[PDB]
Design a protein around this nucleic acid. Sequence first.
RNA 1: AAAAAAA
RNA 2: AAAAAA
Lengths: 554, 553
Amino acid sequence: LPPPGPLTSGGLRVTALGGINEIGRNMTVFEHLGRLLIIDCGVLFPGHDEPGVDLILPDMRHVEDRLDDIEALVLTHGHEDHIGAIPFLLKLRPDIPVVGSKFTLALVAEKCREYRITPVFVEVREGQSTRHGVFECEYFAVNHSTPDALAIAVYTGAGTILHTGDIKFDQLPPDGRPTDLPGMSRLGDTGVDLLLCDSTNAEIPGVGPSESEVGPTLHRLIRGADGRVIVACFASNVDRVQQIIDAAVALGRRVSFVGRSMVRNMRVARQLGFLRVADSDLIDIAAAETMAPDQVVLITTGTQGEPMSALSRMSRGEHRSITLTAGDLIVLSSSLIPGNEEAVFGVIDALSKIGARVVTNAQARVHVSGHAYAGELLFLYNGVRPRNVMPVHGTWRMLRANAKLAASTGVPQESILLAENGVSVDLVAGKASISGAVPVGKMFVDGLIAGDVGDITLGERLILSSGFVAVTVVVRRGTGQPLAAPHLHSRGFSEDPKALEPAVRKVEAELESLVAANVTDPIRIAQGVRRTVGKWVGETYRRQPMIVPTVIEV
Amino acid sequence: PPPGPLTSGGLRVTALGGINEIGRNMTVFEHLGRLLIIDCGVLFPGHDEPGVDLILPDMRHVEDRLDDIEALVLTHGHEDHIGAIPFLLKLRPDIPVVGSKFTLALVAEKCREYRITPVFVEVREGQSTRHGVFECEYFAVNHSTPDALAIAVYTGAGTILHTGDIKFDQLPPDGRPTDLPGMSRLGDTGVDLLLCDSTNAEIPGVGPSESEVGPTLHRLIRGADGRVIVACFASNVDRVQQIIDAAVALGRRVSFVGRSMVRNMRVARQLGFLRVADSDLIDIAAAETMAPDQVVLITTGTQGEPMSALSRMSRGEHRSITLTAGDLIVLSSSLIPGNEEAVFGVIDALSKIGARVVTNAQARVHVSGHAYAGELLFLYNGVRPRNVMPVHGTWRMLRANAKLAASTGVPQESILLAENGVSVDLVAGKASISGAVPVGKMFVDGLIAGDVGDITLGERLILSSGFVAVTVVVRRGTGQPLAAPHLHSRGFSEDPKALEPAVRKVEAELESLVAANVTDPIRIAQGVRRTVGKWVGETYRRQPMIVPTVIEV
RNA sequence: AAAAAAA
RNA sequence: AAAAAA
Ligand SMILES: [Zn+2]
Ligand SMILES: [Zn+2]
Ligand SMILES: [Zn+2]
Ligand SMILES: [Zn+2]
């Protein structure tokens, strides 16, 4: 629980600033002799408890004042959950060298155009090693949801470190590039002192299915459908876009992208040769309303029914470009991320009134996870035989699972280190051990101005769900004398006009026990009025809107 | 298109809630002027209904013809079927509410909460009652909570069967299956309309038996080395029974924890629906007293509702209990869509503690309480209704349940997808949709009704990003300002000098309207808002509410 | 697919 | 197990 000692010269301190008690805002910090290497730098996403904010970030208040001690930032892949906070760490220090694959940095480039940022790009590949001051980094292909992921090895005077990333052990991925358990196992034979292991699906047993399976079940599904077909998947997942495109043209339709993420992500994936699609099969969103329904497949956006994603708008007709018939077939080619049920289950239900057949994961095999199930994780622990393990990229139920997996491999119980954000692992003399914790908290991004939206701002943003009633009196500067009748507004409270009318009376009465008591102070007459209006809505409604007084002096 | 006069002698069914969604179930049958209402419950608030506490059916169609209501009849005691009973009997204390022994003992406590006593009629299976122009026979249905019944309403227009909340488990622990024979004899006499459960009509096959949960628990407690904690809905006496059976079979004893549980289990016992030797019950004082391997705690909070009992011990803010990592907690429940975040939250908190958490995804510790599509097929074959109308479900669930009934022989014309407030007219044998009427969500915020609505809610949604108030004092009639603007914010920023740039921006626009010699307070407050509203957009790109106020003096 | 009920 | 974007 107390902050760690100074790091024994010659050891590694590894500490996570996000992603070890959640799923998102991944950022882990390695220090060796005062120098710092960072792996990943992604975002979270705000829930119910974080009501006004755009994005949550890792708590970079320790790198905060150490910016010249970081040698480079290394990137497993290009998820938002691993590169979202980049344009915010680099604003602080625009010349961090950011290392990552050919596709990862391409997405890091476009997200850094939104901020007037050109970064220090060092593009790597698998089997490559680059050098970074004290640190030496070796890269390994990881097949996964999005192209070109890499696992990362970190060589240092404390020993060898393996970091896996969003990793999945599919022996038949459609791109031809399986995760590289061969290589990682060779590195195991040398010695791996600590293994930073993704634990997303350590709970799920067995071995998950191959992305290769999803392709047949669309080829069949597009076959059997008489009318137009539209398919919504994620946008990082271009293996599956290619699968849909294959199945599409194969049967004679023509593909058509719909949505800003989709249109732009496929653009880059073709420019880099990750997609491959003749222009004869690509048409624009216009022609979908042109050509007979049976001759077009729409690849759209918003598998979480986020309220203005392409497919969410289409389920309301409010997507002026195209409106959905009942001969349409929507196939939710994705997973239902926890916390987005009301959105997506509402959207399917909205689609059901319209009368269009919808196929989701529960009915078919249209989606396959992006992470190793607990039995593909059993391969890694056996091929790498790590000397200590530190579960990562998941919540506590997922890290606890993964610990048991690793222990069940023979990794001793001491060498398992459940290291929640801000708690640090120290690797000196080849032993790994928990050093100490530091407070790690959430940094919000509400629009354009930083630092100013806090636990207070949010607390009252949750208050305001019951609305507010406002009182407003004016006064002659020194007197208590009101100069005008009080003025009660309210928003988010009731929609009866007369709702506040018993309250304008009770204030008027209060407002003159004030006058008949020579309360000259604006603040005190603001308080007493505020209390009369609280205690009224209290007794009368037992609702608790925020009661906001305002006392102007003239 | 509204519905015309029910040509005399016919029967008109209209759902006033329960058919667009899952919840607030209330179905209204009209026959010759008089009305029968089947069920009356609540939909729990969601993420598009911010401050409300309970969504009720739109009884705005029936608040006038209250004295035409012959009786309110109850399939079982789910809050999705008896929640809004006091919000109905406050309008008419003397409505006769008809239900089974258990089903009525819950309307008891629910309405006690509200200073109400209702006029009861306690019925059982295979037994008729008459209610004015309606006669009602009751058939036992097997379901998650005890003593549910399906309902048949014979009237001069034909004969209707209402399933309620049906499931066809063939080995219920209580030992009293759903009365599918009965329903098939009633089928041989010919039913003209079936109101069929639609909840799980999308899942193929025949769901599992409550009889399977028993063993899984008996294993889990036998294998556990410390204390055990099981969470299930307080309605499910049968589940709480095989939890209890298991514990005492293993020299353990039991302690309940939670308003719902402790209440509903004492009642279950008083009415002999749960049988437990006083010898085998202890209290939470004696719970933490004894050895862990002696106890089994039966708790609330399977949905991780924030103030629940488990969700308290997950956070260590519980008096008389604290969860060690030697504990085994069992979420003997499902995960209603919409409470993932909440349940996982509690599962994670429990994980950081170190105690094993067996959910329904790693063992057979829960079974659904609504028939799967293969079970429903035993019903369309057993009843053979001439017309089918699906109920108790969402829209993807209705299209499913409608498809089942076509595949089973009912003509497409005879399968009637009648939404909330949409009417269906059985007029001498034939069934058809006779139009619709607007129907909505009666919200219950605090102590009033009809008070909150669409635009109130839409405001509470905007206020997730705060408001900014700009306040102008003016000399009456002139439009001439008398102080400088007074900006405030509240859920916008903690930068105390955040609005300062904007006072100088609204002064210039007050100074721009005085030259306009525009003196209207409405219009000046329009201008003092669009200014400060597009300074927040420009400078901050945040989108709070803008509340102008212009007090003239 | 029904809630829950103030450390 | 990641977003959506006129
Ligand atoms: Zn990730
Ligand atoms: Zn990933
Ligand atoms: Zn129900
Ligand atoms: Zn039920």
